Design a protein around this ligand. Structure first.
Ligand code: AKG
Ligand code: AKG
Ligand code: AKG
Ligand code: FE2
Ligand code: FE2
Ligand code: FE2
Lengths: 264, 264, 264
């Protein structure tokens, strides 16, 4: 096996091309760069700049108004600074910021659902309840500015898309038993498959561990299922999930609990 | 905004005074000193002395008899030594200790419920099931002797009351984006608002992060809701809670799980 | 009390001998060596050698085929290397490996159930649903090669059996308020009582904290209850469990969640 992190064109995957290669990548590596997905440096610029500006020039009063009463980093500002958002209940410092970041979020959300749809297609997977219900989920977008820097872990998402700005290559993932560099690619977004991909496809997809080594920024978009996403308990045990679930079927909520857990 | 940790007289809050100031403090800071609440250095002395004595002169056999089979630090002795207790199922080394600490616990419990009642009043909050059912809960008292010393975090309680004995100021909380000193006050108790206050009031109360920096002792009283405390799922998502709960309403148990989690 | 880690012969415990001593050990220490249980250095050799061989000579392709898509360390290979297995859904590199490790697992499983049966007998405990249903559970076997090395914690199992290969004594447990050495014993297996023993017997059994200090190998076998193991909520609170469970009875799943948690 070649320990290279492959790259796939989204348009090409949708054309039905490179299926075997794609399947093999999902199974043995669980990560790849994605091109032609509506996400490039061009998008990352407007959002990065305006939020970076906010981090450096926003008054203490402005940041307060966009900070949640509970420091969960789910929405708004968080003091490595962070800015998070989802499909709703967002906190935006200004109209300009809102317009830019709402557009940026939608683009990120569309590419994530699209690539995930391909992950389901390539593995011939039909989630309980159907593909669409599964993909119209609970994504979370976290933009972080970093002026190890993050312990090893795998993501519990379906897929996680990451856009970075270069410094030194900080992001690293395990490939072929070794931590491999995952540098910026102004033309592509980095896709990490998470535990839910592994679970929903019956173990056809690997969820690789990764970490941040020790300025940079990272835009991390988690495509997370709904609390009611349902799956087979026996099948989960067949691919490595050490579940303590009574019964034949269970929901994401039964497994993870009442609060989203993004990494592990 | 003034980054000063304000002080409120409980008797005064009950008189209906300083309401706007109080509301503003809860919202922007989530912490304050509380005076006139039946808790002073005078109470802290008897309990501190007798437990300190126990920590320094209790035989290994005496400490065993007051140590739980599972080291959960929920009740009894724990080897920074600790002594914990609740409304029942307590472990007391002697009759004198019991009389002193039972009285100390009741005083702490009464002040916590009282201040919490005011927090609910100021925010015009009526918990599902009523105020009284909500306040007659599952508090936990932990006394620790310390011969960072405790990582940053916020409390998942409704409110947490802390009485300390000075050394250097170890306790610190984030106020205005900066960790501020929270020194002893023989005349007052320090009140931290926890995540449940934020949740029950619909985001009207902030749960500030805090930590212990690097001898001292601290008496920490967590006022925690019952497993059945119920709340609106949509409203929880509106103020920052990244919940994975199916449905419109949920209980504390659905959210946190089957074991109390005090900090996060 | 003598802070010595006692040793019990399984055959002797089954004969009904040393009952008071046994009861006292469970209550005040929660740990002991177990002899005459079908587990000696002789068994540990075949399994150790063949797996050690695999760790040092298995190709990257061979290790991949025995590695789970999700890095949960529940089954198969994990890069301190580890090899895990349970009653089913196992990943074996070869027929020889399978035959050796299946036999090794069954031996470990039989001794664990046997000693646990004695723990239940000595404390006059009858688990809800009966002894047999309780013991036919969800064990997990983890073999680790180590070329503090492991933070302090107690196990959430019923009992945990450990077989080691000496180096320096790395394994240590708290006995009498002090961390005591727990060296290899080619003739005996080390038994740690876990939280479930404490819970099911109503607090008659202690779950001691332990840790690994800073090459060696350890074969750790967790005897874990089923998701549906049921217990009394009031009784759990009586012996130290800080539960947030509504109702009179609860299952292991209600308490721990949808994913097995082995230590705490
Ligand atoms: O900052 C990065 O590049 C990675 C972040 C990451 O893995 C996460 O947030 O899970
Ligand atoms: O020791 C202190 O002063 C604070 C303790 C604390 O924050 C806690 O126990 O959550
Ligand atoms: O490696 C050892 O000897 C102990 C391991 C242990 O306590 C565990 O896996 O819980
Ligand atoms: Fe990640
Ligand atoms: Fe705290
Ligand atoms: Fe352990």
């Amino acid at each position: 096996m070649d320990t290279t992190v492959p790259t796939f064109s989204l348009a090409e995957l949708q054309q039905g091309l490179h299926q075997d290669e794609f399947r093999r990548c999902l199974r043995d590596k669980g990560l790849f760069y994605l091109t032609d997905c509506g996400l490039t440096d061009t998008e990352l610029k407007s959002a990065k700049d305006i939020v970076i500006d906010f981090f450096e020039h926003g008054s203490e009063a402005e940041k307060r108004a966009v900070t949640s009463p509970v420091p969960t980093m789910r929405r708004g500002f968080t003091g490595s600074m962070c800015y998070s958002m989802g499909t709703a209940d967002n906190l935006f410092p200004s109209g300009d910021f809102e317009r830019i970041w709402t557009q940026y979020f939608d683009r990120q959300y569309t590419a994530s659902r699209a690539v995930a749809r391909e992950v389901l297609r390539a593995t011939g997977t039909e989630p309980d309840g159907g593909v669409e219900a599964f993909l119209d989920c609970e994504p979370l977008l976290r933009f972080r500015y970093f002026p190890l820097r993050m312990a090893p872990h795998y993501d519990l998402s379906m897929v996680t898309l990451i856009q970075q700005t270069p410094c030194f290559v900080s992001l690293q993932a395990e490939v072929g038993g070794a931590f491999t560099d995952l540098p910026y690619r102004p033309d592509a977004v980095l896709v990490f498959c998470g535990a839910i991909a592994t679970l929903v496809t019956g173990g056809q997809v690997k969820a690789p561990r990764h970490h941040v080594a020790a300025s940079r920024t990272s835009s991390v978009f988690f495509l997370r299922p709904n609390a009611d996403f349902t799956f087979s308990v026996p099948l989960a045990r067949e691919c490595g999930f050490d579940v303590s679930l009574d019964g034949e079927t269970a929901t994401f909520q039964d497994w993870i609990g009442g609060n989203y857990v993004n990494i592990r």
